[PDB]
Structure 1
Amino acid sequence: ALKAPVVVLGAGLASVSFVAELRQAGYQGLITVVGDEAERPYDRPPLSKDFMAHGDAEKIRLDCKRAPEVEWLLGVTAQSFDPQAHTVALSDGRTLPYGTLVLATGAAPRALPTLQGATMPVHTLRTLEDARRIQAGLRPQSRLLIVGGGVIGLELAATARTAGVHVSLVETQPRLMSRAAPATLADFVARYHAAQGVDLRFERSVTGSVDGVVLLDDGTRIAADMVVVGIGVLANDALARAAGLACDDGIFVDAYGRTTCPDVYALGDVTRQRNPLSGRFERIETWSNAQNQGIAVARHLVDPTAPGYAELPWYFSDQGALRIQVAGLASGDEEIVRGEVSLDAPKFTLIELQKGRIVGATCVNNARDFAPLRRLLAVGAKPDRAALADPATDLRKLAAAV
């Protein structure tokens, strides 16, 4: 399957992780990476975190040194590829040949149709450019409206509050983090943000805006100096769609990263792939997926005897005093709570079970427990539920014993 030369479209974390693994696995042929951003490859999670404090992009760059002998074509957009001719057409007029093409083009923020012709600042937060523009607007005592109660919106909320910015947040759902969070976590997170002064508006949508005021579907108004929209992302799958690959807001791939087009692979945010815990296809939107899927696909390309991608999903979110870690499924048929759920010195763990089997876990300010829980999750452990609830139980011991 691994035919030289290798061409990768996109230069984010999935791409970097993939090319480093190709080299480490022993592939020595040509590798060329096309990245549309004119930026040394960088990690995105800092952008709604410490980057908002220090503004230093040289703290967030990805290490490409495990990827030697790679030509990175930065500031260049892949415009199309021809899977018969095995070529990629570039915005600078050049063409690249490929033996193996890898689509690692990520996802872009959804726009808000109702703010389409707005006459006040409206941003999304995906890129370094976005983060710099938003950060420049976090003036103390200014008003920020965040649209969407996803993790990135909430990370920005905590960041802005730290900066002395007044924060309102509007969410269409009755809860925060509706996408991949246990309700117990979501409820607590709302309490935390409210206590930090975030003005939360649930079950509201943006209907428009007039002369610096944002309008909502309950017939009300929110004044803001800046709006940041964070209502989710859409896969950057246009090249795949045009070339005849199977796509539906994401490129369908199997556990080997194969698309429906021979010699074309995809990885990271752009893919729609099997979640082994739910057994359903999903577009996973996580840092860990980008890295882990990139590595697994590279490893199997170099060594076809290697297993396909098999890691179970997890993410982290850093929201002010809350260091949140979530693995697996948001719910099963049972939740076990370890510790008190309290705003005082927040520290707790949730475990989700399905007929006795661990299917998900959450740690808030409890990193020590998260590793053992992910191990228990990976093997589908069925531990004694009394022991799981018992504060006397050491989860690392439990994980090591299985």
Structure 2
Amino acid sequence: RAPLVIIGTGLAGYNLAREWRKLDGETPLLMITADDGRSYSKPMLSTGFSKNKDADGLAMAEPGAMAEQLNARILTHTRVTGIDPGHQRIWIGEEEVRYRDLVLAWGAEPIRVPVEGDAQDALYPINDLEDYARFRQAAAGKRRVLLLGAGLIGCEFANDLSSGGYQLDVVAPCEQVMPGLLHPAAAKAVQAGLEGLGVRFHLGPVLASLKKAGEGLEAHLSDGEVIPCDLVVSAVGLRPRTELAFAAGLAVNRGIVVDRSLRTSHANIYALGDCAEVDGLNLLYVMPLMACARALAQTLAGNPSQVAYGPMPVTVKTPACPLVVSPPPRGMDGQWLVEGSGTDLKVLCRDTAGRVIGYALTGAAVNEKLALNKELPGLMA
């Protein structure tokens, strides 16, 4: 009778539900989500123009069909407002839900920045299917887009928006695209690719003030640049949602702290996907999420199981300069060598044995991904 309760109907929630329903078709299942509950592949948000798709074109199933497929009750546009571990329950406003076990699959939030001016609140985040719909409707008939951020998400959107016919300015105070992810030579190759589409980068400044001007906006940068635009996309980065777990007394660090079996610090509470920090690893992509869904499904069905991440390369969706990057496993390093030329770069990290432990591949060099993957150590030992 007491139900499995899953907070979140993104890829983590729905893949855990599906993998677990292969093992247990009789226990009640309750999923809760603050959005509309549609099943969609979030990575596809940044290909909407290049694929000629709107938000509906990206959805794979509606919540009712999902509830039927998973033999679940799914609560939509429903916001969980607290967790009460000592009583095996969660709060929604002034209502409680009791659980057999609780799964935190509630993802990451956009990183905000300080902005002044009368239009300071006219920033569009794009972090789910509803954000996207709302952005697509506002972008209809428009031409000039200012984008904040120069990470993976900002670059993919910059490339995609451009291919959609938009004029792009990218603003970020960091000194290169994808800092922390990319070797500088590789970063330089990717930036040149995007600039070749007409994207203009403003690296160093931040947005100081956003103001209504005539029938659009003027973006006042900290360096005195003032760039006219129709809309502003805020894509600085993402941070796991941890506030509610902290208040409830669960260990949090960058994400919710879980072991390789996805268990939080408290009995009967687990976590996975973007919100989870799994044995030190908070990995904001699908490959690890899927590994976690397979193992936790087992554990929730009485077969205690742990993940053991193998190599998980990141493919960055920038057709202007294709990119695959596989950072070396943490607490492991070697010499970085840049090979190739112009914008077709193969950057390899070799350990003291001479083995390739990480790489960054741009342009034509991405064709080497499948060969080089055979060299890689797993992300966990």
TM-score range for the pair, normalised by the shorter chain length: 0.7 to 0.9
Cα distance change on mapping 1:155 and 1:370 into 2, 3 Å = same
Q: How far off is 1:367 after superposition?
A: 5.8
Report what 1:391 is aligned to: none
TM-score by length of 2: 0.85
Q: How far off is 1:156 after superposition?
A: 1.6
- Given the alignment of the two structures, is residue 265 of structure 1 paired with residue 284 of structure 2, yes or no? no
Q: How far off is 1:94 after superposition?
A: 4.5
Q: What is the correspondence of 1:21-60 to structure 2 with a 5 Å cutoff? A: 21-26=19-24, 28-50=26-48, 53-60=52-59
For 1:310 and 1:266, locate their aligned partners in 2 and report how far apart those are by CA, in whole Å. 16
Q: How far off is 1:189 after superposition?
A: 0.5
Does the 8 A contact of 1:180 with 1:329 survive in 2?
no
SS at match of 1:239: helix
Q: Which amino acid aligns with 2:235?
A: G
Cα distance change on mapping 1:296 and 1:311 into 2, 3 Å = farther
Cα distance change on mapping 1:336 and 1:179 into 2, 3 Å = closer
- Given the alignment of the two structures, is residue 321 of structure 1 paired with residue 287 of structure 2, yes or no? no
Does the 8 A contact of 2:147 with 2:171 survive in 1?
yes
Q: Which amino acid aligns with 2:70?
A: P
Q: How many corresponding residue pairs?
A: 367
Report what 1:390 is aligned to: none
- Percent of matched pairs sharing the same residue: 23
Report what 2:73 is aligned to: 71
Q: How far off is 1:10 after superposition?
A: 1.0
Q: Which moved more, 1:111-120 or 1:350-359?
A: 111-120
Q: What is the correspondence of 1:181-192 to structure 2 with a 5 Å cutoff? A: 181-192=182-193
For 1:14 and 1:284, locate their aligned partners in 2 and report how far apart those are by CA, in whole Å. 12
Q: What is the correspondence of 1:263-342 to structure 2 with a 5 Å cutoff? A: 263-274=268-279, 281-302=280-301, 304=303, 306-329=305-328, 332-337=333-338, 339-342=340-343
Q: How far off is 1:328 after superposition?
A: 3.0
Correspondent of 1:84 among 86, 98, 117 = 86
Report what 1:159 is aligned to: 160
- Given the alignment of the two structures, is residue 229 of structure 1 paired with residue 230 of structure 2, yes or no? no
Cα distance change on mapping 1:358 and 1:239 into 2, 3 Å = same
Q: What is the correspondence of 1:199-218 to structure 2 with a 5 Å cutoff? A: 199-211=200-212, 212-218=217-223
Q: How far off is 1:268 after superposition?
A: 0.9
Q: Which amino acid aligns with 2:293?
A: G
SS at match of 1:378: coil
Does the 8 A contact of 1:289 with 1:313 survive in 2?
yes
Gapped runs of 5+ residues in structure 1? 275-280, 381-402
Q: What is the correspondence of 1:78-227 to structure 2 with a 5 Å cutoff? A: 78-91=80-93, 94-115=95-116, 118=119, 121-138=122-139, 142-211=143-212, 212-227=217-232
Q: How far off is 1:237 after superposition?
A: 1.9
Does the 8 A contact of 1:336 with 1:351 survive in 2?
yes
Does the 8 A contact of 2:7 with 2:31 survive in 1?
yes
For 1:303 and 1:321, locate their aligned partners in 2 and report how far apart those are by CA, in whole Å. 47
Q: How far off is 1:236 after superposition?
A: 1.6
SS at match of 1:57: helix
For 2:241 and 2:12, locate their aligned partners in 1 and report how far apart those are by CA, in whole Å. 13
Does the 8 A contact of 2:146 with 2:170 survive in 1?
yes
Q: How far off is 1:48 after superposition?
A: 1.5
Report what 1:386 is aligned to: none
